[PDB]
């Protein structure tokens, strides 16, 4: 449910006709909650525009997968391409939206999401390119790492890029990094402002019109 | 005469070879060429790829048999044994942002001294990289990656060695085919010349030196 | 919708616009779009292309009608009127090695700060360029070329705007399509989705903004 | 006939299975003289590997030309591509041989062949990339410009490249630039060594091997 609250909230940020990339893990559930009236196109960085849901059993193709080697479908009008073309889309500003997971976001909007020193070394993959390049970056992230705040003054984990992410979404809050700090724009139903401030080590500017959602 | 038996791998892949190997987590990898390299224990490889796939698959089989001195890849999280060998110090791991690796390999293949990219700026990836500002944005200078042999996978080759790929098996293969000094292409089907259109071919036969099964 | 009437060019291409226009000596040029620009004397244009074609064709018609303040191209020799205007000072001409120009445009389109190339080193084109040494070889630092509008030609588009090209009409089109802010693609045929295969498509619909006839 | 002596001699330098690009003009005649047991593949920089002879009347295709916009055919197994790919072949060292025309070659092996100050302003096109990138550059050239030596101590005309050309071929001589200067390896049957040296302003090393052919 806490990941479902996040996926639903990110899905409402998606506009008609956008090219959208979803990181593996939490962000991929965003695909489950697109409004029926909104049609978008999914890019998987291993080389497809026009990715679609997993195939029914028997309809698998060994050469068609997502960025996790898991079987997908391709929709009519899909294009597949090499990895230089894939990241020319990403790094060159033709990817409208990327939704990625997060370990920390800081009050400069800097995201850390590809390494924990000493615990996990999976490598960055394409995260650095996606964050550096996407028109809009949306971070989708449980608010606390077993209580520990993940929205912090300065990232202590290694940075994925110095670009300012455009939106944070947790089970508790919607925060838009801005020129003068992190702006809390919405608060969860089922939470209180006092609770969010306690669980946020980072400084939050509070918006005049604060809303209820995720 | 481009098509040869898999046995001929041992004449082509030297000990200590620096190799480019295509494939995204084993999708679009030359598994047969991989198996031959293991059969004859060609080792001390520098392997340039997107990842080390899985312990049971593709490039990850090379790592399990410890035939790699070094891997230059963007991702290793799906292969816990690549993680262990990195840590125990037996395997150098040079992590490269996937898009930088695509363009570094490409730079070698198309004859560029390097490319400037904003990816990695301000991260550990800026270490020991020249930084260049052009109209006030900074970029890392990223440099061409060469290799002795490119071991690529493709769907079909015609009699002249022209290649086409299939869906997300393309990824890094056509790019590696242009960067290495020798290119060996594992393919699934051999088709008559004229089956692959001039408008469909993605890798010309002229740059493919050898082909297998 | 992507498909519009050709008349809407005078709305989308402004006086003083910087335009990338596809085509090699008029092969793979949007001849209709050019005709529109001439009909409505949209002028003071900066045109980025491989050449100025011939006086009677393609980009060369823009030059005959003195609608260009500047051209950034690799060859102007087939068009005596481009040469005449250059000498007389009415037409600035920036000559660029053809392969440098492909990669300079590409760099804009794929998000690179620049590329380093051995072409031009030690020639007049080294003037006013940063020089960079990488393993003792000298390269020119060459820089992204952006444009307001790409005017490209293609053979076919499907309902979603995916494009394929034909033979040597491809040249610069797929590249400029990624470099400009807005992309207008003149196409010969519009075809149903599923007519252009994922393995065949060379420019995805998502980067194409408008399409004509 | 002086152009045929040159094209025939260059044609002999080509080996089976090479990728070859012929600059426009004199070098294009090389195609007329391939030994017929030697099969090569032609690259045109406008974007084709696998170029063929002009089409019979009626078999023209508007989208298929050489680098001077003249109609060509494509042979079985041809590939067509964009201009960035075209010059990855050329600058990346995949073009085995380019045969270009010449204005001057000097004894450093430097070619000048794309502009004459005050007359010819055609632009370089792909010539700088071809010379810099071709595995082997062959210059195909009248020995003199209406009697003036074209093989000179140092190019006075603008350089196409600082790359050392691998072979000069004229109606009189076959000259190979080397570390120790220009090496004369052959001379035309219809001429003499005194004449060749008299018409070369550049310093020529005369080979022990000296052959007669073209
Ligand atoms: Cl299905
Ligand atoms: Cl014919
Ligand atoms: Mg080779």
Author numbering:
A (entry chain B), D (entry chain C): 2 to 215
B (entry chain A), C (entry chain D): 1 to 213
Which sentences did the original study use to describe this structure?
CtfB contains the acetyl-CoA binding site and the PS01724 signature sequence which includes the catalytic glutamate residue (E46) sandwiched between two short antiparallel beta strands on the N-terminal end of an eight-stranded mixed beta sheet. CtfA contains the acetate binding site and the PS01723 signature sequence.
Additional support for the necessity of a carboxylate is that mutation of the catalytic glutamate to serine results in a catalytically inactive enzyme that cannot catalyze either the CoA transferase or hydrolase reaction. The E46S mutant is catalytically inactive. The E46S mutant hydroxyl group is not within hydrogen bond distance of any protein atoms. Instead, a second acetate molecule binds in the space normally occupied by the catalytic glutamate carboxylate, 3.2 Å from the E46S hydroxyl.
